[PDB]
Amino acid sequence: GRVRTKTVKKAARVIIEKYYTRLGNDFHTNKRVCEEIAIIPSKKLRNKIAGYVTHLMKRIQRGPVRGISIKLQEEERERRDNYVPEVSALDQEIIEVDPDTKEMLKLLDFGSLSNLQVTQPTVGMNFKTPRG
Amino acid sequence: SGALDVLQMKEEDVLKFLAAGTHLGGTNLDFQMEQYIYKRKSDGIYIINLKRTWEKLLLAARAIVAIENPADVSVISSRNTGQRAVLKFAAATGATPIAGRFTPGTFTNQIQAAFREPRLLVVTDPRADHQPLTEASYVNLPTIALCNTDSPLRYVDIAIPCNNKGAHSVGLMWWMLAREVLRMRGTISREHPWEVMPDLYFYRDPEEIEKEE
Amino acid sequence: TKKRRNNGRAKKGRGHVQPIRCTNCARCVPKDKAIKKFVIRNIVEAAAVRDISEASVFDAYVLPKLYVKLHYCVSCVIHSKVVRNRSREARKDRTPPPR
Amino acid sequence: VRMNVLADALKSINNAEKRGKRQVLIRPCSKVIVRFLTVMMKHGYIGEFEIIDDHRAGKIVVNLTGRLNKCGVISPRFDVQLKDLEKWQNNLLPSRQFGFIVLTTSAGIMDHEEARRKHTGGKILGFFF
Amino acid sequence: GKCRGLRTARKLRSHRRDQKWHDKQYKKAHLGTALKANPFGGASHAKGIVLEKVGVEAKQPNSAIRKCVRV
Amino acid sequence: MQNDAGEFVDLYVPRKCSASNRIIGAKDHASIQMNVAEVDKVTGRFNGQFKTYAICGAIRRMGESDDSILRLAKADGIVSKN
Amino acid sequence: EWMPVTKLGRLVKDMKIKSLEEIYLFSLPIKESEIIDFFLGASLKDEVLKIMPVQKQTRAGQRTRFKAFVAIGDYNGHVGLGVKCSKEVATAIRGAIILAKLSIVPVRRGYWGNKIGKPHTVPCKVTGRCGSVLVRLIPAPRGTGIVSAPVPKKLLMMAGIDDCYTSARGCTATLGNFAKATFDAISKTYSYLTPDLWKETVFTKSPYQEFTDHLVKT
Amino acid sequence: PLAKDLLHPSPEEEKRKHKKKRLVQSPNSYFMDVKCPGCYKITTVFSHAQTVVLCVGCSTVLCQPTGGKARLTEGCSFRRKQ
Amino acid sequence: MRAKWRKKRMRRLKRKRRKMRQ
RNA sequence: UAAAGUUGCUGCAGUUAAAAAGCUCGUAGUUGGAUCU
RNA sequence: AGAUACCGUCGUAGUUCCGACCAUAAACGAUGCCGACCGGCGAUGCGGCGGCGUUAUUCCCAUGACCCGCCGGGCAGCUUCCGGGAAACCAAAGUCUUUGGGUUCCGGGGGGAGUAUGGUUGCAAAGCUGAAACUUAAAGGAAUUGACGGAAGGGCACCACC
User: How many CB pairs under 8 A join F and G?
Assistant: First the structure.
């Protein structure tokens, strides 16, 4: 019986989406900053909004939230995804290639590449799942 | 390309394709993707003619370049396998990304918050990106798609024939498209290899990042 | 108006299908229209299995099963909840319930 | 069975043009079909076509330029006098500015305008516009 | 479908002539039973002698007594 | 277009599909007009020129916009033979 | 004061588009009626074809809405039809006028016989269809006027068609289907490929491409 | 689709077709010179022979009629003509 | 009324009439 | 008489609104592949 | 309540076969037949063709059983903004005011009525053909929203229960 109405959720989302810098993790400070930067006509409504704001702060620390979107998160995530390995996972010494794709490459005049190892095709022709 | 040897396909590009499994399609073939397939394997897998892949990638890059406002190109990915690739493409090339769920009415509902009017649309998979594609049919939107052998070609104007199932292949195709578009624009040269590499565009499972941390 | 493309039966490519008697009411129903159940149930219940296996003169006798073929008519099959009404879209579905 | 090979030819052309195809195969061919296609071509409606010679009856590969709205046959081949030509034009043609009724006359197979120019009636084979 | 042949004039005309008899107005105006059963005998007016005054009750939705006469 | 006097009396001249030549309508919102950047033959860079292809919504619905655009580009020298 | 919401609206407001025909040439969807007011909003006349009360059965009564069918168009070369349903008749008419403005299409006019003067009739026989209602427009000689039912006559007059023969089949008593079928027939006039349109199309720069810099910088 | 060249079909596609639906119909059958080691002369056998052919210089079966192509007895060398 | 029972009534009427007109 | 394309040759319908004979065969009738300067 | 029914025990004709009649069914795909064109896909039946590989006839080919394709007819299915349609829906019910491939049957608001009457067929029952007077503003099709159901499935409540 403690589900939050869309008023509280939406107000918390807007406050978090605009004023991320000011708020923290302690409910007794989120309530004060919220009542400072917002017109909340009731103490109980302010308490509910600040509690959900504290819950949202506990939610974001473990990862980006679906309903929360600010530019700071976008830049932080682009910093996070600024990861490049030492060796490319693509190009290695030996890559297996089937005889048919080997013929396709020799048609393209790239069939003389030495990185290619001509593997043998499947022994049989069992690739359809049984019907029924 | 147009038989322009400066635009011809390189040995390194072929090796990248073969390593990412780009040439490897599925076991089913849409009748409109027949012209892009070389031959079926002994295990029912269709091999994608990478010459046609390069031709269609260059055609798509040419279409992208002929939009002098780069933000008027919209790059869409609903699957996680192409979200990071789409974001990297948008960052490098200046396009507008939609990574995640595409809200219906984005192209059609003028009142919506995410309403936009792109001039060209690029998607990772026509099957998984069917919603923007359909909306493309409402606002005169040309469409580029990375199409597998069984991809449906409805509302797809430039279909790039490539494996779009594996993360490696999707990332490599988006990286190659960004490289080609930049090379045609003028920024970055066609002589030395691009300083960025495909693994930036790839997608890593959350378990992979946990392993890397 | 037509409710089903197959008319609630499988009489494609023939003119007459031999009838069968409903196991419940003995109604005559075409063999391709009747709803067919094949119940393979243990001949003893899951309650009596313990006493029967304890009292067996053999060790690991494995009790035999019971293979019954039931041919319900549409009225009886609906009343017995073996099949039920479906939405106009869901009617077309032909995969059996997962069970 | 098959009757009025011209009807089948024109139906194939019409259905291929509706589908947006650049070529259509017509089989079997005939002198009437070739003459009708030539009358069509002189007005720029279908463009060039090729007659494949198989040793029983010809086939025709007709290149299609998407200028054709409807090609149709008039069965039976009603005999048309010069007086009734205006009524046939009103019935079959979309406008007085374009569209041709093809007739077989003793002077050959030709459109209605050429029939009026040569002052001859004939039997109506079909129309195209 | 219908017969479209240069020698089908007789069949078409015969079919039209038989099918006209399935039109109620044509059959009424071309059988004679309606003309013979018409009290006026095909006339527009007729003179008669009033036999009595009657009050006919209106149909069910309405309620009135329409004054008529037996002539 | 032309009257007897020769002046043009149309409101406008609608464009035709580059694939089927059929007229693209005023309310055919599934039709596209796509530009393909032309490239300098030696540097391989955008020279400011492009080829314009208009495809009606019917062809795009049929899934033949890909083939039609590929064929239009091939005939323009954009796409290599074979 | 009109504040554009779309790129086309911004281009029209900033006097980048010089006529409705450039918008029509590229089949762009017009989503703001202020564009139509800008380009034709000195000659457009509206006319309410019908007010139709429709009802939805509910638990405690029938909910009644009114559908306004409104035809619009300057009586030269442009016509639109709008159908809007609302709980209020005035609101329905306002919405129908907006929708008719949004659906205005160019009307191609041609000649019946010889080509002296301005076009006066349809270029050819056209047919529009809407729910079993088939409306055929046939070119007519100059001075004959519109030979039609009143409902298609209103739209044909607002389209600028001086004279035209018509045929109707189906349930034309349903004014909405009749109006939509004749609107389809009218709009098919410019989609018809006549031999005077066989000349190859000379592609031009689209409004979004030819004024992309203006859109970026404004 | 929408641009298939019907005048110049590829030989593989034309061989895939039914023998009557080809551009110009051609049979799938052929004639073979067949030669038996126990014979000093060759004979001509239809690929789809409906009768039991015997060796010209012997009394041995040469091919047995089947549903389609005839079954040539083993040990006999057969070469197609034309 | 079920149409087949109306047909049955008509047939019984016809039989009664046949008994009427011998 | 037109409206009535509600007699439909032009020009109608026949799965469910009225309607394809239970099913084949079959004479008259109607219709009939390419080809000859 | 009544049951001249539903339920139960019996039970005649019949149900079975032979010969002679009857010729009717929601005899249904409620969809005439012949021909052409028009999307895709995966199955399945028969025949034919081609091919890795597995298995049986102890081992070689043939041939069987599989596997992968192709072709031809066939019973169907899924999908599709082919197109059509009032829609339901239909790859035919598409190629239809841009209306004409050939041909047969057949309909013309609802009732009266598939009735009366005549003819014909049958041993009969009945079959085929088949009206009119009179009456009537609607009958009807598809779909939508409600309301209802001695329809199903979910959810809630000490003015429900445990």
Answer: 82
List, in order, residues 6 or more apart from G116 with CB less than 8 Å away.
Answer: F3, F4, F5
Q: Are B94 and B70 in contact (CB under 8 A)?
A: yes
In angstroms, this model's resolution equals 2.7
Rounded distance between C-alpha atoms, residue D65 and residue D62, angstroms = 9
The interaxial angle of helices A6-18 and A43-60, nearest 10 deg, is 60
G with I: 3 or more CB pairs under 8 Å?
Answer: no
How far apart, in whole angstroms, are the C-alpha atoms of residue F18 and residue A20?
53
For residue G124, is it within any domain? Answer: yes
* Claim to verify: residue G7 and residue G101 sit in the same structural domain: yes
Strands G133-139 and G164-169: antiparallel
CATH of region B13-213 = 3.40.50.10490
What is the β-pairing status of strands B120-123 and B73-77?
Answer: parallel
Regarding chains B and C, contact by 3 or more CB pairs under 8 A is answered as no
The answer to whether the annotation marks H76 as part of a ligand binding site is: no
In F, minimum Cα distance to D16 occurs at: F20
Measured CA to CA, the distance from residue G203 to residue B66 in angstroms comes to 15
Partners of chain H (3+ Cβ pairs below 8 A): D, F
Architecture in CATH of D69-129: 2-Layer Sandwich (3.30)
Q: Is the CB of D119 under 7 A from strand K?
A: no
H63 annotated as belonging to a binding site for a ligand = no
Domain H1-82 -> CATH class? mainly beta
Give the domain D1-68 fold.
Ribosomal Protein S8; Chain: A, domain 1 (3.30.1370)
**How many structural domains compose chain F?**
1
Report the structure determination method: cryo-EM
Domain's final residue, options G106, G135, G169: G106
- Which of D67, D69, D97 shows the shortest C-beta gap to G111? D97
